[PDB]
């Protein structure tokens, strides 16, 4: 399968922000702070929300995004986590990891905080939605999850990497857990066969905190069209 880099649906350093503090081709909101080499989507302060979404919609039959990020916090426990989005509408502000609920498309949620006390966090949870599901915060989306894995993406020596592929109707999530310098040491995390998502969507990334708070940083969001 051929890969085409798509600049208009991507961002990265080392000149990530423009002199007016904007990120080219993306809109940010809440308390996201863009800087020259990363976006602090939500800093380690109480009750924060931030997001970053593409200004325009992508129309790709198949795609792959690589998101390189850090979640960092004093505790062995942190909150709330970080979400990667492909959705019909920009979800700039809202209660779902800092973005709009009732989205149409897919959220991949990197959920640090064990809301339902099931000792199964940090987790990565894939959640499809059609415009009508209210995200179940209290249960870490457990009943709404098309698929999930357990993976501790917090406080790692190198950046964590999520490779998210939509190809021939299957959504795969692969994670490089950041233990070593090898940027290609990916491990399988989850997969959903026969996933339907809009033919046009905004990509996005968002994060939030509560009483506990980590710094949520995205160094780069890199989007490819597959054919």
């Amino acid at each position: 399968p051929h890969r085409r880099f798509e600049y208009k649906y991507s961002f990265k350093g080392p000149h990530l922000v423009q002199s007016d503090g904007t990120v080219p081709f993306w809109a940010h909101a809440g308390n996201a702070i863009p800087s020259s080499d990363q976006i602090r989507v939500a800093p380690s302060l109480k009750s924060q929300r931030g997001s970053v979404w593409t200004k325009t919609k992508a129309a790709f039959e198949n795609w792959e995004v690589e998101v390189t990020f850090r979640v960092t916090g004093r505790g062995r426990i942190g909150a709330d986590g970080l979400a990667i989005w492909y959705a019909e509408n920009q979800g700039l502000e809202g209660p779902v990891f800092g973005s709009a609920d009732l989205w149409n498309g897919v959220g991949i949620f990197f959920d640090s905080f064990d809301n339902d006390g099931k000792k199964n966090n940090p987790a990565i949870v894939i959640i499809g939605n059609n415009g009508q599901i209210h995200y179940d915060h209290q249960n870490d989306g457990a009943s709404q999850a098309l698929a999930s894995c357990q993976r501790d993406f917090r406080n790692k020596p190198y950046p964590v990497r999520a490779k998210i592929t939509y190809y021939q109707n299957t959504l795969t999530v692969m994670i490089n857990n950041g233990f070593t310098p090898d940027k290609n040491d990916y491990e399988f995390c989850a997969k959903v066969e026969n996933m339907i998502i809009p033919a046009q969507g905004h990509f996005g990334i968002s994060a939030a905190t509560g009483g506990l708070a980590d710094d949520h940083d995205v160094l780069s969001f890199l989007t490819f069209q597959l054919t």
Binding site: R3, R4, F5, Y7, S10, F11, H15, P24, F224, Q225
Partner: protein
Amino acid sequence: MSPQELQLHYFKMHDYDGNNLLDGLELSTAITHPLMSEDELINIIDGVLRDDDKNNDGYIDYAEFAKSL
């Protein structure tokens, strides 16, 4: 310094991740270095890739670059 080297120097100067490929985000920083309109930035970059990205991979490699010149 021959044309051929000023060109190399330009290519390398905007190759910020050092992969010997120029992508649109790299070209945008070259172009943008009040701010110019994003829409016009998108046209320019789209034009450069239309004209020079012969294999349609979203990058311009050195051969594609040297050929554009």
